[PDB]
């Protein structure tokens, strides 16, 4: 029953004059905040995204960030100017800052990546390079640690603010986080990369929360050749998943797709290959089969 709060920032520097920084904020797999480079203030993506903070203290925090965004840009650019021949554009900086909740305990983090590789973290009071990190980053750390004011104001956020805030989000969005959405399932098939073999597909779309159970069954026998695919998102913050089974042509019969989900409350979705339903569904989706995947 864990919850991870993530503030993601992506900063792009193409040259000495061009830059943009966009940010997104997730509570688990639900987005709570967006902040485009184009926008002046942080936008909410939920009605409870402000947590349990009053206006006159949210605005103080938004100003904290507003000043940070402008400053961060000009700071990186000056560090580039400092490592002039050594490092040059284009530069991609990524920042992942947040805190994981647990009783009253928590554990905060701030990770930084340079050009996709993670190199710097905030630890205790100062910025630190990680083991394996390149040694050219050494001076830029010495420079950034001389900033006592920022270090202090970062320490406040990680030690106090993040935890105190998230507890408020978990309460405010209690209703949305515990929401249950019914998955819908259907069947299809495809030629396997193997000769004379067929790949059965079991599409499971629109379930929430993420955790789900999908297996091809032969009665009481879970087919151990079942490959669970990766979770794919939907526009309404629900989840899509497919489970495939590689069968020999003619071996399709008797097989079923069993779907377990918390929202179903015991009554599993069971789709039988060759069911009058399956026969009816497939007719409702026939096509010209171009340009199908090879």
């Amino acid at each position, epitope marked *: 029953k864990n919850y991870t709060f993530r503030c993601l920032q992506m900063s792009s520097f193409a040259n000495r004059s061009w830059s943009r920084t966009d940010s997104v904020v997730w509570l688990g797999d639900l987005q709570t905040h967006r902040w485009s480079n184009d926008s002046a203030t942080i936008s909410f993506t939920k009605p409870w995204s402000q947590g349990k903070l009053s206006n006159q203290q949210w605005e103080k925090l938004q100003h904290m960030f507003q000043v940070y965004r402008v*400053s961060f840009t*000009r700071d990186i650019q000056e560090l580039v100017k*400092m490592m002039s021949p050594k490092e040059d554009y284009p530069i991609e900086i990524q920042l992942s800052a947040g805190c994981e909740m647990y009783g009253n305990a928590s554990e905060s983090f701030l990770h930084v990546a340079f050009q996709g590789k993670y190199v710097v973290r905030f630890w205790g009071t100062s910025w630190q390079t990680v083991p394996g990190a390149p040694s050219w980053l050494d001076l830029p750390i010495k420079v950034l640690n*001389a900033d006592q004011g920022t270090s202090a104001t970062v320490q406040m956020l990680l030690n106090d603010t993040c935890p105190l805030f998230v507890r408020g989000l978990l309460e405010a969005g209690k209703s949305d986080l515990e929401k249950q959405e019914k998955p819908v399932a259907w069947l299809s098939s495809v030629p396997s990369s193997a000769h004379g073999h067929r790949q059965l597909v079991c599409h499971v779309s629109g379930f929430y929360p993420k955790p789900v159970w999908v297996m091809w069954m032969r009665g009481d026998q879970e087919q151990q050749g079942t490959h669970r695919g990766d979770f794919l998102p939907n526009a309404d913050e629900t989840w899509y998943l497919q489970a495939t089974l590689d069968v020999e042509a003619g071996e399709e019969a008797g097989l079923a797709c069993r779907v377990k989900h918390s929202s179903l409350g015991g009554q599993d979705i069971i789709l039988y290959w060759g069911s009058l339903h399956h026969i009816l569904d497939a007719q409702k989706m026939v096509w010209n089969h171009r340009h199908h995947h090879h």
Partner: T-cell receptor, first 113, second 109 residues
């Protein structure tokens, strides 16, 4: 200009109190520093102000800072003849090497004996 | 202590002038400002170390160069009457900058 100083010039009778003003629109405002420039030389740093609401004292110079008002005041108590100089208000926008200093036009203080 | 040479200079339009600035403080950063009445110091060029040079706020007509740690020179390739000003040099490793004695430069028609 992001840093503004009142008055343009100030005239005080030797051995009285002289008060200098500074207003700024610099963001972020990390620290504020006052300088004394004697006619025909460089800048010498008198005092530094760091905190949201700060106060500082150096011999007979004392200074305040209200970051909320973005305002600063320099006091010289019991002014001397050798205090005739231009006093310059400087706001630094970072607490590190990557900062850029913002300079006021300076107040010119002339002490009539 | 931060030294400057020259202290005074009289120059013509289209002449090459070089203001030298020396420091034994062992600072990495060095700044070139100019002071004109009713303004307050303005940034021309600044360095982050040996071999570095960065355009400041008003670098037009000016070309600074830093050969070594100690020295930092400001070069005017072709001088202008408008470049008549008092030029302060600074250096710093808080972020306290330390200012030079200033060069008074007059460039005539």
């Amino acid at each position: 200009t992001q840093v503004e100083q009142s008055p343009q010039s100030l005239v005080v009778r030797q051995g009285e109190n002289s008060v200098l003003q500074c207003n700024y629109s610099v963001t972020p405002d990390n620290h504020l520093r006052w300088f004394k420039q004697d006619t025909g030389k460089g800048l010498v740093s008198l005092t530094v102000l760091v905190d949201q609401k700060d106060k500082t004292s150096n011999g007979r110079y004392s200074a305040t800072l209200d970051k909320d008002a973005k305002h600063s005041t320099l006091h010289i108590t019991a002014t001397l003849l050798d205090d005739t100089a231009t006093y310059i208000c400087v706001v630094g926008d970072r607490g590190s090497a990557l900062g850029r200093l913002h300079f006021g036009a300076g107040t010119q203080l002339i002490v009539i004996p | 202590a931060v030294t400057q040479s020259p202290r005074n200079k009289v120059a013509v339009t289209g002449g090459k002038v070089t203001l030298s600035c020396n420091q034994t403080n062992n600072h990495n950063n060095m700044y070139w400002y100019r002071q004109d009445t009713g303004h307050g110091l303005r940034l021309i060029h600044y360095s982050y170390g040996a071999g570095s040079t960065e355009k400041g706020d008003i670098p037009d007509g000016y070309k600074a160069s830093r050969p070594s740690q100690e020295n930092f020179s400001l070069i005017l390739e072709l001088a202008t009457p408008s470049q008549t000003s008092v030029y302060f040099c600074a250096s710093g490793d808080y972020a306290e900058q330390f200012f030079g004695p200033g060069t008074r430069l007059t460039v005539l028609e």
